[PDB]
Amino acid sequence: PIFLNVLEAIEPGVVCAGHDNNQPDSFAALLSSLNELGERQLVHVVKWAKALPGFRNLHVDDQMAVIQYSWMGLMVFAMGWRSFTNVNSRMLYFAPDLVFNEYRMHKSRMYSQCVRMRHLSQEFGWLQITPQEFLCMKALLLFSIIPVDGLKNQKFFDELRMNYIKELDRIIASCSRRFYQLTKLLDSVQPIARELYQFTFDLLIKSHMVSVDFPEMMAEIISVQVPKILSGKVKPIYFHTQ
Amino acid sequence: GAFQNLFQSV
Ligand SMILES: C[C@]12CC[C@H]3[C@@H](CCC4=CC(=O)CC[C@@]43C)[C@@H]1CC[C@@H]2O
């Protein structure tokens, strides 16, 4: 199984946030650490994406675009998986040094979003999602959000997305019920990512008033790319009608 | 240019 071999081989390892767990929880400390974690994970997501089967078939502009649109969903989905495998979804396992209990969910001012992420984590358990299903689903998330007006070479993207869908189907191969379930789960990531994009955009704009630090790439992406999503110029590709 | 710089740096 060449395709699964590759997904297993390229899967990123552990990423720490650099959070100081000796200091009391505060909104500014928790969010600054999540932002730094995003910056660190972005590096891993780029290295991973560039090594995916067929990724280099895309126009280079589109390679960069899909990463910059899909990172939130990719990272949330992976975090939900870590939470499921590490703490049975009892907490949000952002990183080994940044685990959210209910108190942190509250103090982050992101409780509603955290609730939804924890629900996503629980779904991995409720659906008995396999590691191989997780890997295929996560790869497909990279190819699940594009400009309404299309990419630089839409044809190459369409073909690549088609093949990742096929790879997910073959790993499934009850099969119809399963595929329906997994595509529903995939769709569910996108509204969660949208809420997080709105939250982080609003936070960036007022960051100087709440002492929240945004690293360089996060600040750029959140001000340059994320607004395309929030303004409706870039939209998720849903399997099912919402 | 920060993301692009990362992307090209591998
Ligand atoms: C964007 C954000 C920092 C990066 C966070 C994001 C929540 C989801 C998330 C999960 C991860 O595992 C990596 C960091 C990210 C990607 C946070 C929501 C508000 C904060 O500004």
Chain-chain contact of B3 with A50 (C-beta, under 8 angstroms): no
Backbone angles phi, psi at A100, to 5 degrees: -90, 115
Experimental method: X-ray
Residue range A1-242, CATH number: 1.10.565.10
CB proximity B8 to A under 8 Å: no
Q: Is B2 on the interface with A (CB under 8 A)?
A: yes
B6 touches chain A (CB under 8 A): yes
Of A12, A238, A240, A233, nearest to A141 (Cα)? A238
Structure tokens belonging to residue A63: 């390679």
- Judging contacts by C-beta atoms under 8 Å, the chain A residues touching residue B8 are none
Q: What is the resolution of this structure in A?
A: 1.8
CA A89 to chain centre: 17
Taking the C-alpha atoms of residue A131 and residue A99, their distance in angstroms, rounded to an integer, is 21
Nearest atom of ligand 1 to the alpha carbon of A94: 12
**CA-based nearest residue to A124, from A77, A170, A91:** A77
The residue written with tokens 């999540």 in the block is: A34
Q: Are A147 and A66 in contact (CB under 8 A)?
A: no
CB-CB neighbours of A75 under 10 Å: 22
How far is Cα A217 from Cα A20, in angstroms, rounded to an integer?
Answer: 22
Residue A40 to residue A21: CA distance in whole angstroms = 18
Q: Which residues of A195-226 are buried (b: 16+ CB within 10 A; e: fewer)?
A: bbbebbeebbeebeeeebebbebbbbbbeebb
Which token pair is A110? 């992101």
Give me the sign of the Cα torsion angle A32, A17, A141, A188.
negative
* Cβ within 8 Å, pair B3-A43: no
Give the separation between CA A92 and CA A74, rounded to whole angstroms: 15
Euclidean distance between the first and the last CA atom of chain B, given in angstroms as a whole number: 15
Alpha-carbon distance A14 to A58, whole Å?
Answer: 28
Distance (Å, whole) CA A131 – CA A142: 17
Domain-wise residue ranges, chain A: 1-242
Ligand 1 contact, A45 CB (< 6 A): no
**Closest by CA position to A123, among listed A167, A187, A61:** A187
Q: How far is CA A194 from CA A30, A96, A137, A241, in A?
A: 20, 25, 18, 17
Distance CA A67, CA A49 (A): 8
Shortest-distance Cα residue to atom 6 of ligand 1: A34
Instruction: Name the DSSP class of A93.
Output: E
Alpha helices (H) along chain A = 2-10, 27-50, 60-87, 102-107, 111-126, 131-142, 154-172, 175-205, 207-210, 216-224, 226-230
Q: Which of A200, A210, A219 is nearest to A29 (CA)?
A: A210
For tokens 């979804």, name the residue: A89
